[PDB]
Design a protein around this ligand. Structure first.
Ligand code: HEM
Ligand code: HEM
Lengths: 201, 201
């Protein structure tokens, strides 16, 4: 990822806010020099992505984690709202399309997590906390968790570098910007809100 | 990515339909052994992903493409609808959450494309065609495209291996499946639609 100045994060907290809001991540590593990716829920431990620690888990029958000793460098991609910008919206002639999106790339070294149970239980707490009502695992479900544990592999990423893209049409003049925002306000309200958050002082 | 049999595509063309429906892809390669990703529009050439050819483009100022010169293997991730499955929806005890999603991973050797104009023009046509109305580039926009070309780097991926995940709760019994589908029918109609298409003969 390359981040133009106009699409940099405005506030430092924005990257961590994106990570916490979009936990279903892509875990990417080099298995024998070839990239391999797994879609998995990953949560953030700490106030900031960079220097922070990510926790996740995957299927033990998924062979991706078997590379985590040999190929410890990993990339985790967190994806926020995104949407196509059609020149139809701009209402200008000569025009070119683009795609607006927010994403955070966290690169660090991966390691296997011994306490898999803690990882998945904290993942439950994090995803249920914003829902109403929240699901609280019963004692029977916690017993079920223990029984499922041989089938999971938990892992930790110590994040060395964090890269954040907030490509939200910030470079546009007011007329073309208003039209992009209005078009997303109807189709893609989550993107519209991110646009609004990107202009804050 | 590991795809259990019950989450495999029901029909082979389902993978290509996902790629065409979700062109805003993640292009991943090994820059100095570390995974590096660029979000870019990628389109499919051919009837099938495997054996097919992907076409995409990125910012020339994005140095990622400079690793594509050694013709290294790249991964292109296409991501369809997805959504968290809370045990609240299941309404059963002992339970465990999961995340439902569809994705296609295309792995091959990347090559820089000389005909960048053709790549970006076919990308326009492909992304505009299902919109209503579709944007038809005027002659002035075509000249604008030509003028923009020094800033773009186009590339092609000859796909060697393809993996498609349609993790859409098809392993649930009938009552729990109905509740999951009904819940997404309200929150996430794109995911609901994918579930219906996965059970079609
Ligand atoms: C809290 C939210 C959770 C989400 C969103 C989630 C999601 C997922 C996903 C996407 C996978 C596939 C990983 C892969 O492709 O390798 C997976 C695997 C797995 N997870 Fe979780 N999980 C959650 C909590 C838990 C808990 C509490 C447990 C208890 C042990 C658990 C146990 C498993 C097991 C056994 C597998 C592999 C076998 C299977 O897929 O059923 N998960 N999970
Ligand atoms: C058809 C839909 C299109 C979409 C969704 C799209 C999207 C994008 C995206 C996401 C980037 C950033 C790539 C990166 O981070 O490296 C980019 C860069 C770029 N694209 Fe496209 N593109 C489209 C068509 C075109 C066309 C027709 C041209 C004409 C030459 C073009 C020219 C460029 C240029 C010059 C850049 C450099 C960065 C910039 O100017 O923003 N694109 N495009």
């Amino acid at each position: 990822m390359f981040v133009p100045s106009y699409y940099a994060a405005a506030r430092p907290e924005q990257a961590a806010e994106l990570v916490r809001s979009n936990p279903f991540a892509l875990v990417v590593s080099a298995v024998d020099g070839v990239p391999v990716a797994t879609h998995a829920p990953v949560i953030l431990e700490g106030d900031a992505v960079e220097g922070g620690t990510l926790l996740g888990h995957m299927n033990r029958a998924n062979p991706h984690w078997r590379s985590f000793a040999s190929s410890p460098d990993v990339l985790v991609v967190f994806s926020g709202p995104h949407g196509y910008v059609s020149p139809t919206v701009y209402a200008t002639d000569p025009a070119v399309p683009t795609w607006d999106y927010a994403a955070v790339h966290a690169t660090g070294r991966v390691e296997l997590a011994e306490d898999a149970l803690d990882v998945v239980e904290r993942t439950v707490a994090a995803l249920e906390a914003p829902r109403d009502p929240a699901w609280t695992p019963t004692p029977a479900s916690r017993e079920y968790f223990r029984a499922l544990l041989p089938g999971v592999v938990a892992f930790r990423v110590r994040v060395r570098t964090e890269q954040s893209m907030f490509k939200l049409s910030q470079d546009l003049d007011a007329e073309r910007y208003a039209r992009v925002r209005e078009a997303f306000a109807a189709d893609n309200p989550g993107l519209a809100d991110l646009m609004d958050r990107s202009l804050e002082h």
